[model samples]
Target: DRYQDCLSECNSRCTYIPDYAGMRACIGLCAPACLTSR
Candidate 1:
């Protein structure tokens, strides 16, 4: 869920296209922290 949340957010700007960029964005943006932050 966290991964999807961040990916969706970042997608608005960076876009989750090109596969690799999307993965990187999601990895960097979402966190185990998110599992708590929410």
Candidate 2:
């Protein structure tokens, strides 16, 4: 469930941004580090 958990957190982190593309970019940036690190 790591991906799910990571994605959940990423969503939470990105949600503060109102811009659609920016939010997705945030998730994109967060996901790789999250996946690779742990």
Candidate 3:
């Protein structure tokens, strides 16, 4: 659930990337929904 939330937040905030890989990388750093578990 958090991973999905992370993905959503990443998509919302990381508009500069324009791809899944960059979005994923940004999500790992910026999304609390992703970082909180890891």
Candidate 4:
């Protein structure tokens, strides 16, 4: 559930980015933190 929250937030947070690569990069950074933080 928390990881889903992370993904949702990261998607919203990265939406301002103009490219898929940039969004993926943002989520890459987010995913690890979400896991470790949990």
Any residue pairs clashing in model 3, and if so which? none
Error of 4 at 2 (Å): 0.8
Model 2 lDDT tens row, 1-38: 99999889788978899998998888888888898988
By lDDT rank, best first, the candidates go: 2, 4, 3, 1
* Per-residue alpha-carbon lDDT of candidate 3 for residues 1-38, written as tens digits (9 for 90 to 100): 77777767676878678787877777667766456754
Which predicted model would earn the best lDDT?
2
lDDT of 4 by residue, 1-38 (tens): 98888888877887888888987887788788878988
Residue-level lDDT of model 1, residues 1-38, one tens digit each, is: 66677656655645545688766666566654455577
For model 4, give the 10-residue run with minimal summed lDDT: 22-31
Give the range of the ten consecutive residues with the poorest summed lDDT in model 2.
24-33
Please give the distance, in angstroms, between residue 25's alpha carbon in candidate 3 and its true position after superposition.
Answer: 7.5
Worst 10-residue lDDT window for candidate 3 reads 29-38
Error of 1 at 29 (Å): 0.4
Q: Please identify model 3 stretches exceeding 4 Å from their true place.
A: 16-37
- Model 2 segments more than 4 A misplaced: none
lDDT of each: 0.61, 0.87, 0.70, 0.83
